[PDB]
Amino acid sequence: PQITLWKRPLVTIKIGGQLKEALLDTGADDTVIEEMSLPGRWKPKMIGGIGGFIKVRQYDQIIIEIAGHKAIGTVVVGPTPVNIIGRNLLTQIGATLNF
Amino acid sequence: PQITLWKRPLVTIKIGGQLKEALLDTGADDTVIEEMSLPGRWKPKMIGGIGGFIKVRQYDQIIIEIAGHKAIGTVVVGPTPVNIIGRNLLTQIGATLNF
Ligand SMILES: CC(C)CN(C[C@@H](O)[C@H](Cc1ccccc1)NC(=O)O[C@H]1CO[C@H]2OCC(F)(F)[C@H]21)S(=O)(=O)c1ccc(N)cc1
Ligand SMILES: [Cl-]
Ligand SMILES: [Cl-]
Ligand SMILES: [Cl-]
C-alpha cells in the first residue's frame, strides 16, 4: 500500500504465533518487540534510543508477517514502549520512503 | 525521490542558514533537533521513546528545508542522539511509505 503520515503508521504483525500492533519505523535500525518468548538462542544487547538505553534479548532468524508480507531477520525483545518494525525488516518487504 | 532503507535515511536539512544532517523518521511524531539557536518564544514539551523521555523546547513556525523541500512548522530542541525529521514535517514535504 501507500501509507501517508498524518497518523502513526501502525500495522498488524504476526510473530511467534501472536498478532501484535507495530509501528513502521524508518528511524529504527532494529526491530524491537515488547516482552514475549521466542524460540531458539538469544544473546543480550543494549539499544539506544532518544532517552538512553534499554537491555534486550537478541533472537536471530525470526519470521514476522508484516501487513501480510513475510520477512525473516533479527528481532530484539525488551521493555520498549511501542513495537517497532525497523529497517532490517522494512527492507525485506520492499518498503521505501517517497516524496 | 524513492529512498530505500538498506542504510539510514539521512538527508541534508537547512535551518537558520546552516546545513545539518538529519534522519527521516516515520516512527517520530515530532521533529527533534540537537541544541541550536532558534528565534522566538518556546513552549515546554516532553517526548518519549526507548530509554525514557527528554525535555524539549518547542519552537513553532520555524523555516526548515529538508532534502531541498521547503517546510515551515514545529521543531523541538533537546538532547536527541541525531537530528530527527518526524511526521509533522514529513507530511509537509509529501512523504509516504510504500511497499
Ligand atoms: C531516536 C531514533 C534515532 C531511534 N529510535 C526509533 C524512533 O523512530 C523512535 C520510535 C519510538 C516510538 C514510540 C515510542 C518509543 C520509540 N521514535 C521516537 O523516539 O520518537 C520521539 C520523537 O517523536 C515522538 O514520537 C514518538 C516518541 F518516541 F514518543 C517521540 S529508537 O526507538 O530509539 C530505536 C533505537 C535503536 C534501535 N535499534 C531501534 C529503535
Ligand atoms: Cl536482520
Ligand atoms: Cl531494494
Ligand atoms: Cl508542524
Ligand code: NA
Ligand atoms: Na534463532
